Write a protein that binds this ligand. Structure first.
Ligand code: A1IAO
Ligand code: NA
Ligand code: NA
Length: 575
């Protein structure tokens, strides 16, 4: 009735989590460090010890909350992160290339897309989204209600995720306009929206009314933007304008032509960071959860602030919008009252964003030799096969495995977001060593046994994670319950093995789509990669990111290593 009928997130047994943790990490640390971690974990998990006390506190939390990890996970994964949102945090979804002969063709697309957003939001708010089922077991639908009603406020040390006549904000030439999408309570038609967008484009070209590019401030580090926003709110005009953005449905960004070839890689860059201030980088407001981009040259997609929802729900929404597209007072410019103080903040923010633009090493690589159909003919799940290929790619290029992240949905449970699948398994290590160590001369028949055992272990970890039995959320909650007892964390969580374990040098996810769109994001540590893939029946799309500052990583070398690994795995499956 009022209460969810879904199960609550399970609390795994303490000794199960501690044993999985040590087994996860043994091959990723030195023998001496492992020996010390074994003793730390034994003391933490001893009968009558601290771990048992924290586990009892966690079972009490599970009883008193809908979801015992929600608050800790939201803060740990998103709100505590100080990095600027572009590239480091906010993923982008790139739509098919569009062809816009005239400005009017760009605006008709934007009007059609806005109409689709209004229609989808009406379905959402009437609770008419058919409940998703696993692969079926019903799934939590609460992420859908965060697509349009969320705003991420910056804080000095921790951000705040806020839930809220309806309006969109249109960004054009770094200027922001309120576009009301109802008049006389009747939703604006696609034709009315077109008429309004034309007025906006005319107003935005006016030099005598041009305001400073305040959106650039949202692209900065979170504490930097917290400081600049605090300067802004000293003025009531700015407060009014910030309130309008905080309460909009979404942004629609009418970007300027990019001036570069519209390859998939280049369209993805424009969606990730707008190409910086000199291009479209200030035509943005990164705190708002959805920024649809409809560029004059046909580059279209959506930039996502992903603190309120994960990738499956986002793609369900965007696929619905795109498929739906197949079937009067003037807008109000938001005013700003700036100072030389704010001008200094703008210059700083432009410089910092340019460092992100220049630092990103990004490639879209389409593997075209095979995809899901071939993989399923090997009695393998496509996801597990591709995760083992990524381990082999990393090992053959960098000669070690590293802590690897892969999102696993826990939407089977109330308020469920994700837990981590740790794909750098002991079985993956045995396989990649056998493949790469030519001196060992392991027979191909044995390499194939090791391959299938690595895929089996990957599949098992995935089942463990999606059923709430993996370890990362459990350890996070024990850690934060310990911090509530005493600000000095116990040795368990100060141990260098634990800190290492959560620096995801390879950060991955599978985002399958049914249309030509694709998803991408940056790495999460300076010496890391981001790898987001889209498996299709006969192809697999890989979006690979890394940072040019890190001499070890290279996105083009990693994409080549992925190709070589998929070909090696094909050859082993063809003996
Ligand atoms: C480093 N990283 C970053 C993200 C994920 C998974 C979540 C996600 C992936 C791709 C698109 C998304 C669009 C909207 C919301 C979440 C999205 C995994 C690793
Ligand atoms: Na996790
Ligand atoms: Na690099």
């Amino acid at each position: 009735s009022e209460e969810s009928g879904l199960p609550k997130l399970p609390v795994p047994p303490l000794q199960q989590t501690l044993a999985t943790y040590l087994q996860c990490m043994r091959h990723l640390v030195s023998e001496e460090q492992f020996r010390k971690s074994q003793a730390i974990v034994q003391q933490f998990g001893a009968p009558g010890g601290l771990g048992e006390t924290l586990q009892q506190k966690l079972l009490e939390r599970q009883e008193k909350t809908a979801n015992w990890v929600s608050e800790y996970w939201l803060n740990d994964m998103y709100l505590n992160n100080r990095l600027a949102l572009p590239v480091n945090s906010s993923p982008a979804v790139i739509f098919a290339r569009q062809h816009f002969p005239g400005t009017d063709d760009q605006l008709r697309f934007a009007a059609s897309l806005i109409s689709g957003v209004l229609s989808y939001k009406a379905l959402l708010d009437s609770h008419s989204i058919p409940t998703d089922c696993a692969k079926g077991q019903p799934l939590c639908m609460k992420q859908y209600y965060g697509l349009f009603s969320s705003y991420r406020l910056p804080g000095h040390t921790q951000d705040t995720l806020v839930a809220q006549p309806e309006h969109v904000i249109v960004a054009c030439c770094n200027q922001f306009f309120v576009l009301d999408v109802v008049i006389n309570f009747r939703r604006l038609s696609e034709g009315d929206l077109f008429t309004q967008l034309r007025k906006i484009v005319k107003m935005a070209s006016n030099a005598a009314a041009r305001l400073p590019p305040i959106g650039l401030l949202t692209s900065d580090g979170r504490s930097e933007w917290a400081e600049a926003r605090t300067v802004l709110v000293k003025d009531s005009t700015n407060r009014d304008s910030l309130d309008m953005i905080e309460r909009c449905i979404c942004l629609v960004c009418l970007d300027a032509p990019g001036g570069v070839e519209l390859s998939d890689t280049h369209r993805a860059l424009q969606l990730l960071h707008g190409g910086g201030y000199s291009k479209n980088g200030a035509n943005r407001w990164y705190d708002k959860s959805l920024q649809f981009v409809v560029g004059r040259d046909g580059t279209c997609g959506v930039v996502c602030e992903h603190s309120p929802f994960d990738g499956i729900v986002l793609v369900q929404c965007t696929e619905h919008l795109l498929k739906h597209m197949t079937q009067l007072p003037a807008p109000r410019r938001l005013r700003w009252k700036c100072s030389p103080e704010i001008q200094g903040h703008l210059a700083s923010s432009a410089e910092k964003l340019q460092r992100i633009v220049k630092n990103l090493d990004f490639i879209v690589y389409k593997f075209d030799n095979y995809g899901k159909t071939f993989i399923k003919k090997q009695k393998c799940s496509p996801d597990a096969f591709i995760q083992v290929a990524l381990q082999l790619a990393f090992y053959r290029l960098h000669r070690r495995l590293v802590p690897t992240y892969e999102s696993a949905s826990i939407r089977r449970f109330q308020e469920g977001r994700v837990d981590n699948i740790r794909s750098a398994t002991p079985e993956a290590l045995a396989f990649v060593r056998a493949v790469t160590d030519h001196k060992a001369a392991v027979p191909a028949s044995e390499k194939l046994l090791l391959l299938k055992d690595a895929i089996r272990a990957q599949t098992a970890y995935t089942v463990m994670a999606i059923t709430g039995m993996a370890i990362d959320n459990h350890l996070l909650a024990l850690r934060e319950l310990a911090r509530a007892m005493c600000a000095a964390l116990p040795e368990m969580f100060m141990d260098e093995t634990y800190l290492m374990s959560n620096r995801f040098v390879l950060s991955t996810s599978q985002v399958p789509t049914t249309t030509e769109m694709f998803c991408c994001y940056g790495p999460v540590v300076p010496n890391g990669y981001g790898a987001c893939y889209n498996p299709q029946p006969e192809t697999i799309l890989f979006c690979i990111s890394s940072f040019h500052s890190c001499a070890a990583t290279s996105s083009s070398k990693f994409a080549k290593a992925v190709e070589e690994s998929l070909i090696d795995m094909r050859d082993l499956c063809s003996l």
